[PDB]
Ligand binder design. Structure first.
Ligand SMILES: O=C(N[C@H]1[C@H](O)[C@@H]2O[C@H]1c1ccccc12)C1CCC1
Length: 283
């Protein structure tokens, strides 16, 4: 079926939970043996969220190459994404090592450091220009260059320096700051505006490594971001945009990381975002 009328048909019939459970039943199951090794327990935020072995990002380190991060490679859309958990106190150096080694231009953050009165990720970037951060375990230096605070999101320019080689690179930090503590946003308008700002920066384009996207577990809000982006790109590429099937795209993405889209409300919100976004694109 088309999307917008399939949407109204699920609303009128109140069957979002059943649609979402079907997706959960059909989703891929691949091994995640490296994630479960005892030496990696303090590298995982949640015991039930792990990268598959076949798609995990490897650190370029001979001691321990493990990070909780996955490469989502979308062949028809010609887009790739790295989805990862919010960094932990003992993985902030690994996180920036990955950004460096994978040649990423942009980092997309969809959570606040504290939500619901608890810590959802480490403070992994500097908050003042004159107070830079040094990660001694991976030999990187990170400096805040500029910050632009808007009503729904903040964009930061960061400098990452590899202290071994003295090479430097500019990284863009895109921080969506207004996702509610509970539920999903009422309108997708600010989330779509944010997606378009990431696109306009070059961070999603083939001349760079994959964008790094995270929330707390790296599957819920993060899944919504890449699902909406890929579906909109396919609607622009194809002769028949009504042939894009959001459930099929989501199942394709779940071949590369488990659990993408965590609730039926997040699924409905993803439909809403693609539907509204397809009208603004045109034409
Ligand atoms: O090359 C880098 N760091 C080097 C450190 O001197 C040390 O050797 C390298 C390294 C890599 C992983 C852990 C520890 C080390 C950074 C470029 C991204 C990582």
């Amino acid at each position: 079926m088309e999307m917008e009328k399939e949407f109204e048909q699920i609303d009128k019939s109140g069957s979002w939970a059943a649609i979402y459970q079907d997706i959960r039943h059909e989703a891929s199951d691949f091994p995640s043996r490296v994630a479960k090794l005892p030496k990696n327990k303090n590298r995982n935020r949640y015991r039930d969220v792990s990268p598959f072995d076949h798609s995990r990002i490897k650190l370029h380190q001979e001691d321990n190459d493990y990070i909780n991060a996955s490469l989502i490679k979308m062949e028809e859309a010609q887009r790739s994404y790295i989805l990862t958990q919010g960094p932990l106190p003992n993985t902030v150096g690994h996180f920036w090592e990955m950004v460096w080694e994978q040649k990423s231009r942009g980092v997309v953050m969809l959570n606040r450091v504290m939500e619901k009165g608890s810590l959802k990720c480490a403070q992994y970037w500097p908050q003042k220009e004159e107070k830079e951060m040094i990660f001694e375990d991976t030999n990187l230096k990170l400096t805040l260059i500029s910050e632009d605070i808007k009503s729904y999101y903040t964009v930061r320019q960061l400098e990452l320096e590899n202290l071994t080689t003295q090479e430097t690179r500019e990284i863009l930090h895109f921080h969506y700051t207004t996702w509610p503590d509970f539920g999903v946003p009422e309108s997708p308008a600010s989330f779509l505006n944010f997606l378009f700002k990431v696109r306009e920066s070059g961070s999603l384009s083939p001349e760079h490594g994959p964008v790094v996207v995270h929330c707390s577990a790296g599957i819920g809000r993060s899944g919504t971001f890449c699902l909406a982006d890929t579906c909109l790109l396919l609607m622009d590429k194809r002769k028949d945009p009504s042939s894009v099937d959001i459930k099929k795209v989501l199942l394709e993405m779940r071949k590369f990381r488990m659990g993408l889209i965590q609730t039926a409300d997040q699924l409905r919100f993803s439909y809403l975002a693609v539907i509204e976004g397809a009208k603004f694109i045109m034409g």
